[PDB]
Amino acid sequence: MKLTGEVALITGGASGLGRALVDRFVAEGARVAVLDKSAERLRELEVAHGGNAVGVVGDVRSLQDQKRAAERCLAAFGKIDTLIPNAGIWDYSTALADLPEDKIDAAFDDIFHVNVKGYIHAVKACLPALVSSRGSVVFTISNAGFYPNGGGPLYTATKHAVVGLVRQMAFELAPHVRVNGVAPGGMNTSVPLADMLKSVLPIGRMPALEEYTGAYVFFATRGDSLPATGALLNYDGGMGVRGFLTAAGGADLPEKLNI
Amino acid sequence: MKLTGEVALITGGASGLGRALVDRFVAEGARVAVLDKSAERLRELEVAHGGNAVGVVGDVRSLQDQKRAAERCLAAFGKIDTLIPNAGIWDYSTALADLPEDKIDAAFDDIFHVNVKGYIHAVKACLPALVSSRGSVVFTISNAGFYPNGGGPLYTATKHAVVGLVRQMAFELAPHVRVNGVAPGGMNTDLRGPSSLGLSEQSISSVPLADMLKSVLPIGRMPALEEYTGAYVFFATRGDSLPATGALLNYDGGMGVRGFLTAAGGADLPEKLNI
Amino acid sequence: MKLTGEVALITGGASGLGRALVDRFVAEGARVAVLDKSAERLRELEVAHGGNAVGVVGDVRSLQDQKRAAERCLAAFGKIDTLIPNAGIWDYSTALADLPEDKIDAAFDDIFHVNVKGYIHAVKACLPALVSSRGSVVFTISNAGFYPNGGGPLYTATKHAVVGLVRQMAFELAPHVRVNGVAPGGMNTDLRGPSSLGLSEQSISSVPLADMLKSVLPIGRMPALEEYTGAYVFFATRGDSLPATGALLNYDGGMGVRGFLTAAGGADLPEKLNI
Amino acid sequence: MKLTGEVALITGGASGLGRALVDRFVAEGARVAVLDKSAERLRELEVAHGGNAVGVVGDVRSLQDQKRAAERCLAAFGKIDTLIPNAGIWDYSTALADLPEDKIDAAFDDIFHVNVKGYIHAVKACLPALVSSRGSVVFTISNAGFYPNGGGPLYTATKHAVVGLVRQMAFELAPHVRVNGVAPGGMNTSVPLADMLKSVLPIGRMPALEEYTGAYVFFATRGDSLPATGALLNYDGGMGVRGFLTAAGGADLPEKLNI
């Protein structure tokens, strides 16, 4: 019950990883405003958490759709303690040499409006409310904001850009708003599952969406993440610490120590 | 309580952050074995927490001592779920020009044996127990592990070195043990130093934090030691930090994202938005 | 001369650093094709370097233009050995609170289409030629690609984004093309901005560098534009930078390793050592 | 002829990568003082570069052996423009679980005295001379100061530590001395050569020691690396940008573009 008397806003939270955040957050005493594209999946979400969660149908790319989401949150809950810019769109890990000349301009704009511009507006929209409550932002980054091969050029640049957002907003919004980011990866949400545990994830297992929720709960806990601003907790099963020939270094440790 | 029924081993956990971690972890249900140089301070917490904490007097540079603590924790509690190598020595932020040629070699060894080697024996000792419980290692680092002026050549080099521990240990101990690092910043710890290093400069070059905070902490305040225990509990919680290994949490109040003319860039926000 | 007989394609290479790069590369024996928005400035250098440089007037956001330049370089010089995507737009370091709601969406696209998309079409265009000559891509980044207060939300996000280009392009174009990044810092460039962003604040928030240098540059001086061309030549040289791909050169005078109270920590060194 | 009228000091430079630096540096008009353990290989080096290179027999761990090396350089060349702390000792990539209880203390001290303490003294020794000439330091780091599996815990910590040295010395020695570091890796100097190009090095080829020399020449060039201080140029064939399933992303690019 770590988030008792708390209010959080989550974009793109009516599905995928953002939905897991919702369920968990509610299950922590929190109160979650949700901006998303799906009117149906927002209504199903709302009855799932009776009066602990509100949902506003919108387009994360729209600044106005973000201001509304802020306003409605303020309407029902009267405050905003943790904003979680999260709504993201993928590029199918498409290589540059495979992005066609007649599609690159559209593809760029769409992916950048959702992953970067979407995040900007959210923070812009909620700025009054966050300053008012001296709360925090926790962006959803990704393994792809730090290392390649998590996506194509478009995805990688958009997720490296939200690292800049983490840093610049951590600076600009201080001392009244703490900005942070979590970088999840290797998810139950291109690459074979057998090559995933062997050559990608040192931890050796595809974690459930529920297991990616705690890192966010942390940054949203009143006085547990107070020194945190500008922080980037990489949360991808250890993609940036994997070996050359094998992801895991000591798979055979138990019978190296006769445990 | 996140850590009910768990067992933590904190080194240097009788004073400072390492001690706040004990109080926090016990308060979070966990039982805590502690290795530290101070016999008094260990009894001081032994009484305070009753049958939830035990303390072993020894030295972090000694592997025998490290092993003795790891065994003591097994004897009393039956396992090791979280190991927190925390014990650290500051270099008074003494520059290279200020290091005495006759005192430098001695100094190196003193600081590197605690800040780095002490961590290695902490892991070496507790490893069998950690692979058995498929547990975690959470390293105390420092802002001095990522950016300069947090200490002199020696300290900054040590903390940077323990960044390399996180990464290697995360690799080597996959998939059973998780290894990560917490990097504290604006705490008001004295941070002890080596006798091999003289008293020469301890007040007027090692600058106090309150005097300079506007150039160091964006968050615009000095956090209490208890505000730094939250990150470690996070790593200590099995169902919260499961997909986290090789993770580096910069926990310095924004020392790495401070701005040029001042630390924080949004002093005038409430003026500009009306609160 | 390191780059005798080589061919470089610089974008935004008619003014600022991009233009100093032309002068340097020609002076290093290389022939240089240039894409830039200014017809005058391109003729200005066309005459200056004679048959060693050619310029194409167009826009970096346009792939057709990018392709047209890549072809122009083939037509005149016969190949492309080094591509330098350099053309960049500043956001006047305009904060998020200061971005007008009615002007923000327009602004985003303007800046992201040059700083990021412009780079992508630069690579997309010149790629066939680069895989053919097994050449290199050297990206102009910025201190704003690594640490904050070098620009507002938009600019810092763009440059950070092109860090992600370096890494992905380095991966994707292995083993034939090498992709790296140069990250300039204390140059006295005006760095143009978008009309979609108002004149509102251009003198008194976007602070001049000379006023603040003691809080920004450890090196304790503002380097001339010619001092920044050396890193690119390095990547342009086949026998010097062969085992370098995905490399990031922080070229900012020490912006990332500046200290808390002042940029440089060794002001008083010669006093302390006697020179 | 980029280093005409220049003087550089190189530790551990009578063999390995440090020797390649020497040959190249001399071949650039530079003048190289060399501190190393080998008396024979120092003499062979000296006749190889007649009067353009001096060599002083010493132990990099000794501060005094470093001061001498500085003094002798000053004797023959009268100045020191680029110091290159380079002498390094490896741990056989030995895992922690394989470092024996009766050896760990000795092994720690030896590897840390050479890789970290060796570097410190060099900069300490040459400080007067470098400040006097307003020159630079270029440490030899390694892929192992950034990612794991380049060595064991001991090597990785020692090379991560010299990253701290790069940063702290870049700060402390400014504005009079520029500190930098090069991070070479995947060298013709444990791991099979067939798994090296496939899963380790995106560039697909083990580069010669000569090809690792240019990066150092760069940092030592009068007015080509003036803005450089605190810089970390990773020089390992792209170990930190390799994919999950394959090092190289577009091996089959030529016949994807019918070049």
- Kindly state whether B48 is in contact with chain C, defined as any CB-CB distance less than 8 angstroms: no
Order of all β-strands in the sheet with D6-11: D53-57, D30-36, D6-11, D82-84, D136-140, D178-184, D232-235
Find the catalytic residue in A155, A212, A216, A235. A155
B230 backbone φψ class: left, alpha, beta (φ>0; ψ -120 to 50): alpha
Half-sphere exposure of A198 (CA within 13 A, CB side): 9
> Residue A88: CB partners within 8 Å, gap ≥ 6?
A12, A114, A115, A118, A140, A142, A158
- Kindly state whether D63 is in contact with chain B, defined as any CB-CB distance less than 8 angstroms: yes
Secondary structure of B173-199 in the HEC alphabet?
A: CCCCCEEEEEEECCCCCCCCCCCCCCC
**Residue whose pair of structure tokens reads 């925090």 in the numeric block:** A136
The CA distance from D130 to D109, in Å, is 28
The architecture that CATH gives domain D1-259 is 3-Layer(aba) Sandwich (3.40)
Q: How far is CA B89 from CA B60, B114, B149, C178, in A?
A: 11, 7, 16, 43
Domain B1-275, CATH homologous superfamily name and number: NAD(P)-binding Rossmann-like Domain (3.40.50.720)
> How does DSSP assign B97-141, residue by residue?
TTS-HHHHHHHHHHHHIIIIIHHHHHHHHHHHHHHHTT-EEEEE-
DSSP-assigned letter for residue B56: E
The CA distance from B235 to B136, in Å, is 7
Find the catalytic residue in D119, D155, D216, D235. D155
**Residue whose pair of structure tokens reads 């460039």 in the numeric block:** C189
> How does DSSP assign A71-106, residue by residue?
HHHHHHHS--SEEE-------TT--GGGS-TTTHHH
Closest-CA residue to C170 (of C244, C242, C114): C244
| Interface-testing mutation among B3, B166, B219, with chain A (most A C-beta atoms within 10 A) | B219
Segments in chain C forming alpha helices (H): 17-27, 39-49, 63-77, 101-112, 118-132, 153-172, 209-212, 230-236, 269-273
> Is C269's CB within 8 Å of D232's CB?
no
Amino acid identity at D124: K
DSSP-assigned letter for residue C113: I
Strand bridging mode A6-11 / A82-84: parallel
Is B155 labeled as catalytic in the residue annotation?
Answer: yes
Minimum-distance CB partner of C168 among A109, A153, A162? A153
Closest-CA residue to B89 (of B190, B188, B179): B190
Q: How was this structure determined?
A: X-ray
> Is A240's CB within 8 Å of D147's CB?
yes
Half-sphere exposure of A228 (CA within 13 A, CB side): 32
Number of other CB atoms surrounding residue B47 within 10 Å: 9
- Kindly state whether C264 is in contact with chain D, defined as any CB-CB distance less than 8 angstroms: yes
Quote the tokens at residue D196: 């090296």
Number of other CB atoms surrounding residue C183 within 10 Å: 27
Does residue D8 have a known ligand-binding role?
Answer: no
DSSP-assigned letter for residue C98: T
The CA distance from A138 to A83, in Å, is 6
Quote the tokens at residue A171: 């600076």
Instruction: Report the residue of chain A nearest D256, measured CA to CA.
Output: A97
**Residue whose pair of structure tokens reads 């107070």 in the numeric block:** A226
The CA distance from B146 to B96, in Å, is 19
Q: CA angle at residue D83 from D78 to D89, to 5 degrees?
A: 135
A100 backbone φψ class: left, alpha, beta (φ>0; ψ -120 to 50): beta
- Kindly state whether B234 is in contact with chain C, defined as any CB-CB distance less than 8 angstroms: no
Closest-CA residue to C237 (of C56, C24, C14): C24
> Residue B20: CB partners within 8 Å, gap ≥ 6?
B225, B226, B228, B229
> Is A245's CB within 8 Å of D97's CB?
no
DSSP-assigned letter for residue C216: T
> Is B153's CB within 8 Å of D120's CB?
yes
D249 and C171 Cβ atoms separated by less than 8 Å: yes
User: Please, what's the b/e burial string for C193-211 (b: 16 or more CB within 10 A of its CB; e: otherwise)?
Assistant: bbebbbeeeeeeebeeeee
Q: Measure in Å the smallest separation between the Cα of C211 and chain A Cα atoms.
A: 21
C-alpha D121 chain-centroid distance: 15
The CA distance from C238 to C73, in Å, is 19
> How does DSSP assign chain A, residue by residue?
-TTTTEEEEEETTTSHHHHHHHHHHHTTTEEEEEEES-HHHHHHHHHHTTTTEEEEE--TT-HHHHHHHHHHHHHHHS--SEEE-------TT--GGGS-TTTHHHHHHHHHHHHTHHHHHHHHHHHHHHHHHT-EEEEE--GGGTSSSSS-HHHHHHHHHHHHHHHHHHHHTTTT-EEEEEEE-S------HHHHHHHT-TT-S---GGGGSHHHHHHTSTTTSTT-SS-EEEESSSGGG--SS-S-S-TT-GGGTT-
Q: Measure in Å the smallest separation between the Cα of A162 and chain C Cα atoms.
A: 6
> Residue B106: CB partners within 8 Å, gap ≥ 6?
B194, B196
Order of all β-strands in the sheet with A136-140: A53-57, A30-36, A6-11, A82-84, A136-140, A178-184, A232-235
Q: Measure in Å the smallest separation between the Cα of B263 and chain A Cα atoms.
A: 7
The CA distance from C104 to C194, in Å, is 11
**H or E stretch at D34:** strand D30-36
Q: How far is CA C180 from CA A61, C132, C213, D215, in A?
A: 32, 18, 28, 13
Helix (H, G, I), strand (E, B) or coil at D127: helix
B52 and B28 Cβ atoms separated by less than 8 Å: no
- Using a 10 angstrom Cβ sphere, with 0-12 exposed, 13-18 middle and 19 or more buried, the burial of residue C268 is exposed
Strand bridging mode C136-140 / A6-11: unpaired
Q: Measure in Å the smallest separation between the Cα of A237 and chain B Cα atoms.
A: 5
Does residue D26 have a known ligand-binding role?
Answer: yes
- Using a 10 angstrom Cβ sphere, with 0-12 exposed, 13-18 middle and 19 or more buried, the burial of residue D162 is buried
Contact partners for chain C, using 3 or more CB pairs closer than 8 A, are A, B, D
The resolution, in angstroms to one decimal, equals 2.9
Quote the tokens at residue B193: 């130093």
The CA distance from A211 to A191, in Å, is 21
The residues that bridge with A30 in the sheet, in sequence order, are A6
> Is B260's CB within 8 Å of C212's CB?
yes
- How many CB pairs below 8 Å do chains B and C form together? 40
> Is B234's CB within 8 Å of A224's CB?
yes
The CA distance from C264 to D173, in Å, is 8
> Is A251's CB within 8 Å of B178's CB?
no
- Kindly state whether D203 is in contact with chain A, defined as any CB-CB distance less than 8 angstroms: no
The CA distance from A212 to A23, in Å, is 12
Helix (H, G, I), strand (E, B) or coil at B171: helix
